[PDB]
Design a protein around this ligand. Sequence first.
Ligand SMILES: CN1CCN([C@H]2CC[C@H](n3cc(-c4ccc(Oc5ccccc5)cc4)c4c(N)ncnc43)CC2)CC1
Ligand SMILES: [Ca+2]
Ligand SMILES: [Cl-]
Length: 435
Amino acid sequence: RIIVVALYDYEAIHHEDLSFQKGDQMVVLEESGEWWKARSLATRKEGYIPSNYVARVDSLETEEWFFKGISRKDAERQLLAPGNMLGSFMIRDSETTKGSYSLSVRDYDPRQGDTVKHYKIRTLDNGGFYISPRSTFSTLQELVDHYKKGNDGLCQKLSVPCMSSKPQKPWEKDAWEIPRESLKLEKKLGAGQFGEVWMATYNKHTKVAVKTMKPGSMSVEAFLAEANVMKTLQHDKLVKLHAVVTKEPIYIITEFMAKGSLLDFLKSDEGSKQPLPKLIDFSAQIAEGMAFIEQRNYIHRDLRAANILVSASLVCKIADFGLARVIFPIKWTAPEAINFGSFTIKSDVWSFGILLMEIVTYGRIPYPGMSNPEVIRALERGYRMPRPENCPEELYNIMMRCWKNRPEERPTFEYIQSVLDDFYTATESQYEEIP
Ligand SMILES: CN1CCN([C@H]2CC[C@H](n3cc(-c4ccc(Oc5ccccc5)cc4)c4c(N)ncnc43)CC2)CC1
Ligand SMILES: [Ca+2]
Ligand SMILES: [Cl-]
């Protein structure tokens, strides 16, 4: 008999799913992935619930200050999000110490401004917890209550848990292939050589985006094959594919990203007011997404700001991954792909360097003034785009390493991400040590 408690309010929108409130307890009848079958102890009703909206009773996940599956960098990002203040904190799973926990706290100093500090929490293998060996607690809540009184070694006194946000509702169960009649394409966002993109509604309850592909250009059994791989590439920094209409013309259904492309966002007014450290964070998010693709031994083939999407909370997500395979733009392309058609993960690295320049120049076109054949004649000679007035030397150095004539001499995305993530933090300063 497994009992869970709702972490957030939820309103049913399907046939057999349950509505519930935060605090509602339920009995698990079936664990079947993103959707669980359960009985509400409040309503006595049986039905389906989103598994990531619930957690077992009195487990850490029920605590308002606990954040599961959160990396140090994500914690930093979430803590520096609007709605938070000094002392805003979170207890989270340790990234570099499996099985253990870490404390992240919002801090401030006149030199650096608003910052986030991180403290290792040590388990006593018997066993309570401590950050300082001279101060030990039975539970994490006790630790939290202690440091709420005063910093006692910490950079700041603990105040209020990090502001959280509802997770996205999971897509309808067993609805990868949908009938076209389930969609209403309401507003056309853009149109191009290979098709259009629309803002749409699925079954009158879910806002989505739909990419409509012109029959051509390309094969429908080459797409359907690739589409079953693209669905397995799930990551926070890759746009989520929800569904596909298999009858030509092909429709591709994904999550709606409220702020459109990165390219358009950088040229906008809200984008023009983003400081350099924010632009670097954008790059780091994209590198994280590309490190995932690299790790899954996949390729993108069309990396540029136009194919990066931006959410309302300024999360960058990679789009059109693995679409060029089953189907402008030589300024983003590696020499070995322009000349020999050799597309690898290393050619994407070349593309990333160019994208980096787009970001730092707020959407300026690569090689301004030059032309497509005119650029190719510059790569042979060994010409590279000069450093802009707002680009740091070390940032420009990353571009140069991406722009090596020899693909083998180009760094991995795993490395690029690690550099960009900690661009402003010395390695020795990642965690804070307290006696
Ligand atoms: C100046 N411009 C440039 C292009 N413009 C818009 C830029 C953003 C575009 N746009 C595109 C998308 C989008 C949607 C689906 C898609 O399909 C794949 C996803 C993953 C892998 C393979 C395929 C790919 C992209 C999009 C969006 N989801 N949510 C919100 N906006 C979206 C829609 C057009 C507006 C005109
Ligand atoms: Ca340290
Ligand atoms: Cl019961």
